[PDB]
Amino acid sequence: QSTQNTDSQTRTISKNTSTSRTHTSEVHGNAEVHASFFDIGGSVSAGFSNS
């Protein structure tokens, strides 16, 4: 029979770097109905966002 004892100390020094590039499109919509005592309106909107 045999017994083994072991100790281990590890020093790990690590580097990392990164880039990233995002390209974002977007198409918005809107409708609106306004009402008053005597004033009524309506509105339609649309939006085109690049990024």
């Binding site: 974002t24 977007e26 918005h28 004033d39 966002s49 990024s51």
Partner: peptide
């Protein structure tokens, strides 16, 4: 110019909306 003044007060009666970005 009374009609023009009334139109101006009607325009004031409201909001020029907001500028929102959803990017």
């Amino acid at each position: 110019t009374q009609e023009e003044h009334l139109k101006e007060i009607m325009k004031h009666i409201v909001k020029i909306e907001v500028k929102g970005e959803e990017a």
